[PDB]
Amino acid sequence: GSSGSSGENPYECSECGKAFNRKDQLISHQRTHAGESGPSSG
Ligand SMILES: [Zn+2]
Numbered sequence: 001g002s003s004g005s006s007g008e009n010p011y012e013c014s015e016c017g018k019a020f021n022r023k024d025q026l027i028s029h030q031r032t033h034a035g036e037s038g039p040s041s042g
């Protein structure tokens with residue numbers, strides 16, 4: 001593994017464990033692991 005390690009994923013999710021090339025990409029993705037709009041009373 002010359003010139004560092006294979007592949008460069010400076011951004012990786014914690015919920016699923018995905019990896020993106022750009023930050024924004026990961027951010028927009030994280031949205032999937034979020035959905036609190038409706039008034040959850042229970
Ligand atoms: Zn994820």
